[PDB]
Design a protein around this ligand. Structure first.
Ligand SMILES: CC(C)(c1cc(Cl)c(O)c(Cl)c1)c1cc(Cl)c(O)c(Cl)c1
Length: 260
């Protein structure tokens, strides 16, 4: 199995860069989320009072929340970018294509990973020091009431796959190296890499979840739900910028969303 060996090694490599690039792994998240802890347990924000009291420990309000999420996104992009660099082959591509892959692949990954920080009842924030309930979010005045919902929706179905960090590291790699993205100057070197990634992913999922029939197909199919989330988000923003023309947007995100 020297063929296999090569892939395993690649899987191992991606996991490592993953752990090195992302401060809040699904493992830390699930530990805080469940209570393996007298030391990890989060402060919960579930209403306006606790919001005010959460602020005690570490604009408007619905807007203040939204811009916090937006800024975390910016921070998240930085992380993913550092991770991509580590994907064997990626930095060797046409610079323009590197930029194009990041442009499209970054949100998909954000939400995939955002799922690690959620369960049906809500989502970790402030690096896990806090926990905002799904219900508090819905309560936010339209249109912000609607922004975390579709994300929770995905995370619930997605989390059902029970992927761990090591499966995810390969999966976000497969996402970045997507050849079908618009305006790619040079697709084939991309497809060749992703073939390898896909091969690695496949192997990884059956070694690590052998009693889980067709998880690979099941997991590949989730990429439809991701683009939907992304699309709605972008629709949501098109609207916000017209109702709240006093609310800013981070130029980086502005650039990612442009012509998306
Ligand atoms: C709310 C949440 C989960 C988030 C993150 C991203 Cl990246 C995102 O794009 C969206 Cl809409 C929501 C978040 C917010 C903060 Cl302030 C934080 O420190 C952490 Cl660890 C997580």
């Amino acid at each position: 199995n020297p063929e296999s060996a090569d892939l395993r090694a690649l899987a191992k490599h991606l996991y490592d860069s993953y752990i090195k690039s992302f401060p809040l792994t699904k493992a830390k998240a699930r530990a805080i989320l469940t209570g393996k802890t007298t030391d990890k347990s989060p402060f919960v924000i579930y209403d306006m009072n606790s919001l005010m009291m959460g602020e005690d420990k570490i604009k408007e309000v619905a807007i203040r929340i939204f811009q916090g999420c937006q800024f975390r996104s910016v921070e998240a992009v930085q992380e993913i970018t550092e991770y991509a660099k580590s994907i064997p082959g990626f930095v060797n591509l046409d610079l323009n294509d590197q930029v194009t892959l990041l442009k499209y692949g970054v949100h998909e990954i954000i939400y995939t990973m955002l799922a690690s920080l959620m369960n049906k009842d809500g989502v970790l924030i402030s690096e896990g020091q806090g926990f905002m309930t799904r219900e508090f979010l819905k309560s936010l005045r339209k249109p912000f009431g609607d922004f975390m919902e579709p994300k929770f929706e995905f995370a619930v179905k997605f989390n059902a796959l029970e992927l761990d960090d090591s499966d995810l590291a390969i999966f976000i790699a497969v996402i970045i190296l997507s050849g079908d993205r618009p305006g790619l100057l040079n697709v084939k070197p991309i497809e060749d890499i992703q073939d390898n990634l896909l091969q690695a992913l496949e192997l990884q999922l059956k070694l690590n979840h052998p009693e889980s029939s067709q998880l690979f197909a099941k997991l590949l199919q989730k990429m439809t739900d991701l683009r939907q989330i992304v699309t709605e988000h972008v629709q949501l923003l098109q609207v916000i910028k017209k109702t709240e023309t006093d609310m800013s947007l981070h130029p980086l995100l502005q650039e990612i969303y442009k012509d998306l």
